[PDB]
Amino acid sequence: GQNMRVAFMPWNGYNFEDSILVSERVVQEDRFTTIHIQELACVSRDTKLGPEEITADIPNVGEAALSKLDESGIVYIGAEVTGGDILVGKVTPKGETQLTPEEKLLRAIFGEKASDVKDSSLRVPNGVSGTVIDVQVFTRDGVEKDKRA
């Protein structure tokens, strides 16, 4: 930790039994500013029918959110995700829906359910802000992930 100048006195009530009163200069020095690095673990489900690769170009997304992503659904190194921003593009595979007599216009617009009904993006649950650090896409023997990695 770090040491500070301590005054041993009872204050106006801000220290009741063992409470702590601090100064504003500690905030001014950016002191003990914690840096929490969490994991974004993406998933690409493989079903009995349909392709297996999760790609870019997901519809029902505004152009303000698509500008911070590179190809194949990855953001640039140094871009800030704040709450509901898209860090990785979640893709449901094109199976389970091609043998459907109904919903042809939905397959023309937002085909094979590329997004959910009403959910947030798959970066962090809401209430956060911060930039990306490092992307760790690791490949398989014979998988063709050259354009993303």
Binding site: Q2, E29, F32
Partner: protein, 149 residues
């Protein structure tokens, strides 16, 4: 879950977690070392009749059950002559006053009764034991700071 006086320099009585299991996890002390059979042995230096030999041995519980162990805080000059007629000592764990030549062992340093977790706290005499345990439970978790003073 209680403390036996064999726990002098083998493990520490301080470092226990703050959960329900308190008393059963004993962290190993600084100078203790596992013997070739598997038991813990803390070092003791040899005390002769006139001088004090600087070599050290590793003593087990069965050996110290019949041997005599002096305290850590006792007077010693440069040569090794005992200037105190009645040095406060112990035989089997409980402190009792012996003579100047009835002991043949001596603690190396005043560190064996505490492990590496609570050795960072100055003045452990002047703090309560449960509060030293609480300070250990404070030192067991801390995020790193940017300045690191």
């Amino acid at each position: 879950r209680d403390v036996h006086p064999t726990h002098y320099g083998r493990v520490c009585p301080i470092e226990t977690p703050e959960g329900p299991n308190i008393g059963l996890i004993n962290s190993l002390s600084v100078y203790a070392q596992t013997n070739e059979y598997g038991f813990l042995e803390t070092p003791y230096r040899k005390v002769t009749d006139g001088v004090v030999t600087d070599e050290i041995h590793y003593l087990s519980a069965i050996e110290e059950g019949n041997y005599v162990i002096a305290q850590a805080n006792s007077n010693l000059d440069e040569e090794g002559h005992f200037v105190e007629d009645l040095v406060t000592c112990r035989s089997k764990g409980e402190s009792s006053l012996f003579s100047r030549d009835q002991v043949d062992y001596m603690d190396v340093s005043t560190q064996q009764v505490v492990s590496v977790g609570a050795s960072l706290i100055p003045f452990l005499e002047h703090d309560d034991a449960n509060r030293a345990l609480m300070g250990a439970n404070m030192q067991r978790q801390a995020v790193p700071t940017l300045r690191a003073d």
